[PDB]
């Protein structure tokens, strides 16, 4: 639907939609920008991620409320949970489709390729949260994406790089919540935290603030898990 709008206007409107907390609009603007076929800048990648994370985050929260009601239990609660589930799956498939056509294959720099592979892992993870039918193949798809991202990140990025940190955080969550691997989750969070800590001395004040924020999330998880 956004084929007639200029790329720059789509990006401008995504920023306006963010300010207005209109995340569905923001996602549609960024989908349109991606479909222009040009690579995305760092800022643009972040706009894409914020938009879809907010959309799917609302869906996931609703799904969890409905699934809890359904667990406690006519066909209505199941029907509605299924409706929300299908809508969530659709959003995940849309994101995965953008990554596959053709953001990942055009991403050569480590910052972009890791970013997109992390996103791929995240959206398969969300699919895994609701899967019951090929749960295993979905889980393996998430794992593979996260693993490729981690292999690049460890080769190409310092241990304090925020995308490297956020990837490791989310892969640890994948292990704990999806793969039933809490020890792997804790290991990963601890090693990531400690290697980042040892590299903080290299950073500026601003970079330090960025890295330590994400480190605190790793710590929050380790506190919950141990």
């Amino acid at each position: 639907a956004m084929g007639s709008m200029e790329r720059a206007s789509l990006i401008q409107k995504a920023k306006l939609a963010e300010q207005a907390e209109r995340y569905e609009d923001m996602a549609a603007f960024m989908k349109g920008a991606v479909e222009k076929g040009e690579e995305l800048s760092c800022e643009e990648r972040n706009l894409l991620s914020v938009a879809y994370k907010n959309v799917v985050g609302g869906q996931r929260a609703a799904w969890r409320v409905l699934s809890s009601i359904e667990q406690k239990s006519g066909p209505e609660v199941r029907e509605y949970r299924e409706k929300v589930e299908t809508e969530l799956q659709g959003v995940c498939d849309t994101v995965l489709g953008l990554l596959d056509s053709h953001l990942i294959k055009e991403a050569g720099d480590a910052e972009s390729r890791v970013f997109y592979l992390k996103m791929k892992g995240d959206y398969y993870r969300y699919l895994a949260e609701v899967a019951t039918g090929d749960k295993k193949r979905i889980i393996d798809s998430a794992r593979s994406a996260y693993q490729e991202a981690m292999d690049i990140s460890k080769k190409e990025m310092p241990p304090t790089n925020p995308i490297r940190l956020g990837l490791a955080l989310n892969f640890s969550v994948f292990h704990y919540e999806i793969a039933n691997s809490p020890e792997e989750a804790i290991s990963l969070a601890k090693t990531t935290f400690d290697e980042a800590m040892a590299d903080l001395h290299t950073l500026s004040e601003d970079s330090y603030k960025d890295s330590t924020l994400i480190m605190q999330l790793l710590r929050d998880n380790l506190t919950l898990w141990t």
Binding site: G166, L169, V173, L217
Partner: peptide, 6 residues
Amino acid sequence: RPSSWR
């Protein structure tokens, strides 16, 4: 629920 990146 643990924290993923936010």
